[PDB]
Every structure is written in structure tokens, then in C-alpha cells.
Amino acid sequence: AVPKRRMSRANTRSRRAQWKAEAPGLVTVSVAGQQRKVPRRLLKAARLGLVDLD
Amino acid sequence: ARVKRALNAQKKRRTVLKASKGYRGQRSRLYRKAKEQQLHSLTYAYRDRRARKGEFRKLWISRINAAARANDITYNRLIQGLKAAGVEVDRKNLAELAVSDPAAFTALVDVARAALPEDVNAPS
Amino acid sequence: PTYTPKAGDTTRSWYVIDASDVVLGRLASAAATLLRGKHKPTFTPNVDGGDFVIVINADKIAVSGDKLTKKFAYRHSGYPGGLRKRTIGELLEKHPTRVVENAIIGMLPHNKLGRQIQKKLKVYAGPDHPHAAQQPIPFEIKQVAQ
Amino acid sequence: TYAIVKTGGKQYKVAAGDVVKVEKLDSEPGASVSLPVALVVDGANVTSKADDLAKVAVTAEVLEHTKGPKIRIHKFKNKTGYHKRQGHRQQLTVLKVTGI
Amino acid sequence: AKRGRKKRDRKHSKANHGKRPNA
RNA sequence: UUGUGCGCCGAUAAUGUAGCGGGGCUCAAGCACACCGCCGAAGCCGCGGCAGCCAACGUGUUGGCUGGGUAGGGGAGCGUCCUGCAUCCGGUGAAGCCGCCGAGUGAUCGAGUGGUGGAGGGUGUGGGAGUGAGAAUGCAGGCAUGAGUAGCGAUUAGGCAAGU
RNA sequence: GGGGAUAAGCUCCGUGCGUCGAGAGGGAAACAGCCCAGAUCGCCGGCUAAGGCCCCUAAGCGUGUGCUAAGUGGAAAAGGAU
RNA sequence: UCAAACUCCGUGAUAGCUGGUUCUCCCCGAAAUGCAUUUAGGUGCAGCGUCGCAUGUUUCUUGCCGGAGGUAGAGCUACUGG
RNA sequence: GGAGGGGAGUGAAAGAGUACCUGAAACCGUGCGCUUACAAUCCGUCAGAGCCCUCGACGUGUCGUGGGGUGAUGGCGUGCCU
């Protein structure tokens, strides 16, 4: 089908504000004497030397 | 000879859109939408200028009547009494009295009590 | 110019009415008058400045005619065939408070201010109330001669 | 302490110092003008009879002549083509009650 | 039926004085 | 047995009370007859400003009547551009634009001032008009809502290591 | 007054009758034609019309004498009935 | 794309037809009826509007006097018909 | 990585950077003040509480012949044109 009206500013921006993003929950790692912040999902793989840390 | 039209329009656009700072949506940005609402707006202002008189008078009367009824007299007979007594005070000021100084208003109430007819429902 | 009540202006009071065989209409009109504030000289319709009301013996309300058993309160859920009705007698013997409430609520504005007024209406099916620590003023419904 | 002045086909509650706006009277800024009265109050009691009220009169000083607010009119009707613009400022005359 | 009658009978009110337009 | 004033039954449809506008009302807040007051409109009056027709007078004052208005007839005006003529401001900062403060009965105005900016403009009188746009399923360019949605082009199917 | 079924918010004529059209405001619950009334602009002034005064809705649960028992009021016929 | 292609030109074809037509105020202010009509949705003249000049109350209203009418109504051995 | 940018410079000015005179509106966002999650809104208008900014007379904060932005809540109110 097809809309019928020019859906307003309020409604538009309101719903548009649901299309957002969340940030992964970060955690320290003692990468060879120094520290970097990495998700928890990848913690073991970092401590074992696979994660490409730039 | 050729006359570009830009200035001669910009003038009234500026006027209107200055006069619609507070409106909500396309009534606050766009000339073809704020012009209409200005028509309706000025008209409703006119009508309300004619009618706020009755609004305030209604208000004044409600105040007067409640004041009186707490002094145990009705509005209608109060005004009968003041008309008879030739008292001149208008309703705006009777209400102001009611708010500020109920004593003086009670005195006026008593004047009307005194000056009313004896048999109010008489055939006179 | 004319006086308009500010914030630190209102003065409240707790009135209490008896419903001992009083007529529902009289009682309800009186309560509406009090709650809306048409008895003080500080009245303004934009402001709620009336007085709290406590109704007692509400199960003693007695009406005229056959309204006890020919009159029908209605409702509607919103669903189809979800119109359901009740007499006044059934509704007293179920819960009496609702009769007097709805009666009064129809004597008020149905606007935001009316909803904010209904807060100021307390009704109790018996003679009692927990609101003695306000020392409620007894109101006796009277009619002013003229 | 206060009184109620009649003027402008209107009435105004006053006391000494209470500045007021009214219709256009006929005088110069700084002059004085007297006025009739409807009510008077000395403390608690009242003067409410016409003979005493004619014997009493209030005196005021003309601060300044003035112009009220700008009032826009755009009379309008639909499907017609009838607009009519018009405007108004009402002339005023500020009084200051000297005494009573 | 009902609708026309209620029109033609609202006309017998007091502020209309017995008459209304389109009955 | 007559005539009356209110009344009863007859009475009975489909989204939901639903043939008082609602609550509610016969402890009439209902019908009738008289009585008293009152509320109520942009009506009339009261205080002020403008305007048109007539009249009276004096070198434009007052007064009475009047002033809803579409098709339409008539009258008087603002604004834009180019110009004839006379004068004024302008790199010691014009225009144009964003404004603030103010004005005019209105179209509109600021030789009233700030910011930006960088070279022409204003005034009075006359002349001439490509002379005022909100609508033509109007034209050209730009940008929105739909929307960060539908789709990403077959019915063969991709994967792991190393690489730069 | 005609046509129609002496039906139509039907159709066709009359009318120094009206209003709407081109006419706002108040009342009629909302309601171009009904009743009142014909808007120069302003006022936080007063009196009234039609209509209405229990609360919502400003104004009277007004005065006096009688009727109503049907929620008549707040649709209705032929006819029936102590 | 075919009940007679396409392109340029005539050509800015023509439409009793639909739509659209831009700044302000002041004064007055309608009609929707008649005759005709290849005509009924259009148009011509008369009607009602305004502008200018002329004629000055001739218009309108109320009262009184003078005049014809065949309507409502009523009547019928006062005619025609039932 | 490069695009692109920040400093240093040229230049009277880089709010003249080869996307460049001026550089409007729609439109797109960032901050600051008010307001908004029990409410039925041609989206406004009349009254107006409360808070925030400002000018001025004064006095340890304070009303005013004030003015402006928002504006709870109440009444009224059926888009524009043809």
C-alpha cells in the first residue's frame, strides 16, 4: 500500500530514535606487560595470542 | 524594464514569520501555512476581545454570589437592593471587596437588607 | 487588576456530610459545589481550591419513585455484546459507594481538573472514617431565603 | 483607606500613589484634575450616599499621555475573498492619585 | 423513519417556535 | 350520562445505554394561572480615536445622520525597476542579508541603531512599466515524509592454509 | 393552490412576506434558511430581547393556590378501560 | 501506438468547455425573474446595481372621499349539471 | 594508507583555499532555559499559576504605568482556494 499523509516531525524523530546502538561491555587485558580494553567474549583468545590488537 | 520580484515578496514573508514564533510545526516555518493560521488567529483574538467582558463578568458574579450566600443573601436580591438604594459600585469592584475586605461587603449586604421591599413577592 | 490566586494562597478544609435519608441529588449537588469551590470568594476555574468531602451512612441513601428497581446503571466493556447493566438495589447491596460517587462525578467537569478533583472525594459505606485527625466540619445542607 | 473613582464610563479602585491608566482626559502632563466618587472607605466604615459622594472628590495628577497596545485586525471570511486589515492604538492618560 | 421523525419533532421545541428549516 | 386538565394500554429492530443534551429529579429540579427579581448578544447607552454625506460658520473647526457585504461600479494610496531635472550620504564602509528597538488606520516603514559584507545608492517632482503569486493534475533546481524499510537480478554450492 | 396517494428534505406558480445567498454574534445539545438582532475600532463599564436560573452552565433546590404517580415530563394512531 | 502512422509547417488551430489570474484601504451594492432562441448549463433586450449630469419630493407611509372586480364564504322553486 | 584537517605562512581579510565574490529559505544537526509519560489536541486564541532572562527605582533582597521566552490549567473555536 501507500501512505496517505506526511508523517510529522514528532513521530518521525521519535521512532527514528529507536534505531540506535549499544556499546560492548569492555574489560581490561594484561597484554604482555601493558593493558588494553577488549570485550569479555574474546578474553581468552586475547590471552592466548589470536586477537589482532591495533 | 524587467523587474525581478524578490524584495517585494520577502517583505511580507518576514513580517508573517516573525509573527508566528511560538507555533508548532509547519505553522512556524512556512509562509503558506502560517498565513492561514494568522487569519484564524487574528480572528479568534477579535472574538475573544469581544467576549472576555462576559467572561470576567461571569467570574465576578460567581464570586459575589458565593460571598453573599455565605452571608445568607442571594445575588438577585442583593442587586435589587443596591439598585433601590442607588448604590453605584460595579461588579468588578464588589468582587475586589469580596476578596480583600469582606467586612465592607457585609456592610453593603446589610444596606440592601435594609432597603429591600418588605414583601418581595408582592404584586407591586 | 482582578485578583488571581497565587501558589501560597489556598486554605483547605475537610467537610463531612451525613447521608441519613438525604436525597441523592441534593447531596451530590452540594458536594460538587464544595469540591469545585463555588462557596468561597476566591473562586477561579483554572485552580482547584475547593474542600475535601467525607460522606457517611452512604448505605442509607434513599431515592424516590421506582428508581431503586426500574432504573438501570449501564456499562460497556468495549467488546461486542459487552453491555451489562445493574439496578440500583443490586448495586447498593454489592457496594453502595459507587452509586453516590458516579452520581457526583456526573455533576463535575469531566476534564483534567475534574479528575484532579475526584482525588478530593472520600466516601465510606458506614458512619465512620479514619480522617478524624483533620477534625472534619459537619456540613448541613441549607437553602438561603431571599 | 481607599476609594472607587468613576470616570471613562468605568470605575477604578484607588488610593494615594496608585497609578492608573484611563481614557484621554484633557490636560497637560503635570497638571491636576478632580474626579467624582462612588464609594469611599475610611478604615472600616463606608460613605455610600450620593450627597456625601458629591461632596467628596478625588484629586489626581496627569503624569503623561500615552498610547496603548497595538491591536491588529484582519477580518476574514471563507470561499469569498474578503480580507480587511485594520489597526488600533487607544490613547491613554496616566493619572496619579495625589490625595483624597 | 426514526431520523426524519426526530427532526420534525425537535422542531416543536420552545426556542424554535414551531418551525425549522428542512423540517 | 355531558364537557373538561393532566394520565394508562395499544407501542413495536438490528455496533452500545440511546425518543431529557448528561448527571439526576415527584422531600419536583415536571404541567398550568398569576407575582417577584435576575443572568443574557458584537443589540441600546456610557468614555474615547478614525471615516463618508449634508448643513452651519470661518480662512477647516463644530454638529446631526451614517459606516456587514460576495458578483460588481466608482474613489484614494504603499511598494519594485529604469529614467529627466535639483540636491544628499558613500572604502572615515552603500546595497544585500541576520537582527534588536520602535512607528504607521493598512499595503508597509525606519536619514534608528548592532553583526556580516565589500561599491553604489536616497530624497522631491514628473515620465514609462516585462510593475506585486498561494493554488493552473503549473515549469526549472534543491531537500524532506515513506525509510535507514523493500530490495541487492534465479532454479550450480562453496570451503581451509599460506600470500602480498 | 395545481400534479402526486390531498406522500416526499418531491416538483411547479403566486406574495412592498421573510431570511440564506452576499450576514457575523446569542438561543435552539451539535445544526446555511427557525426565534432575537443587522458587527466603525478599543474598555478587566451599565441596562435589556429570544431564551433560561438543582450541578455540569453565570442566574431562583424563588412566592401562592391546585393537578400529575405515569419517570408522564423527555414521539405517536383507530380503538379499549370502574 | 493504426476505424487511416510519424515529423516539420499552416499554427500561438478552435473549443457555448474545465482550471488559473498576484498589493492595500474608502463609499454604495445586487440577482437567480419576463419575452424570444437549432434554445434550455450559453446569449440578446427589459428587470434589480452603481458613476455623472438634469428634474426637485414627484417615490414611500398613515388617515378621509370616489371606482371596477365575482376570490373565500354562502345559496340554489335565482340558471347549467349531480 | 590516502582523502581531509590542525598549527606556521602568504595576503588588507583564508567569516577569499583552486568544492573558492556575497552566501537567504526549505532542509540537517550540537549546546543553554522552560515544558512534556492519567491523557482525546484544524494544533490555535482570551484569562493565567509557576520558573528563567532583562531595564529601572530601591536596598543586605525588592516591586514596577514594565517588556520579552516557555507556558500548567479553564472557557471559545468545523483547514485555504475554485
Backbone angles phi, psi at C126, to 5 degrees: -105, -165
CB D24 within 8 A of CB D56: no
As a whole number of angstroms, the distance between CA D60 and CA D98 comes to 5
Q: Which nucleotide is nearest to B43 (CA to C1')?
A: I45
Closest-CA distance, B80 to chain D, in angstroms, reads: 16
**Resolution in A, one decimal?**
3.5
Which of C 102-141 have CB under 7 A of nucleic chain G?
Answer: 106-110, 141
Size of interface B-D (CB pairs under 8 A): 45
The answer to whether D57 contacts chain B (CB < 8 Å) is no
d(C-alpha C36, C-alpha B76), whole Å: 22
- How many Å apart are CA C71 and CA C81, to the nearest integer? 20
Integer CA distances (angstroms), C23 to C19, C30, C61, C99, D39, in order: 8, 11, 7, 12, 44
Cα atoms in the Cβ-side hemisphere of radius 13 Å centred on C138:
5
Instruction: Name the residue among D39, D52, D44, D59 with its Cα closest to residue D100.
Output: D59
**Residue D4, φ and ψ in degrees, nearest 5:** -135, 110
β C14-18/C137-138 pair status: parallel
**Partners of chain D (3+ Cβ pairs below 8 A):** B
Does C146 contact chain B (CB < 8 Å)?
Answer: yes
Quote the strand ranges of chain D, DSSP E: 3-7, 10-14, 19-22, 32-35, 37-42, 45-47, 58-67, 71-77, 82-88, 91-99
Q: From the CA atom positions of chain E, what is the Rg in Å?
A: 8
For residue B111, the chain D residues in CB contact (below 8 A) are 48
Shortest Cα distance, chain B CAs vs residue C144, angstroms: 6
Query: Which three cell numbers mark C36?
Result: 469545585
- Contacting chains of B (3 CB pairs or more, <8 Å) are C, D
Q: Which helix (H) or strand (E) holds B27?
A: none
CA C12 – CA B124 distance, rounded (Å): 45
- C-alpha span between D1 and D16 (Å, rounded): 9
The total domain count for chain C is 1
Provide the 3-class DSSP secondary structure of residue B87: coil
Question: Side chain identity at A17, as an amino acid letter?
Answer: A
Extract the C-alpha cell encoding C81: 455484546
Q: How do strand D37-42 and strand D45-47 relate by DSSP bridges?
A: antiparallel
CA distance C63 to C45: 31
CB of C2 closer than 8 Å to CB of C42: no
Q: Which domain holds residue C66?
A: 1-146
CA distance A49 to A40: 15
Residues forming beta bridges with residue D73, ordered by sequence position = D86
Q: Is the CB of B31 less than 7 A from some atom of nucleic acid strand I?
A: no
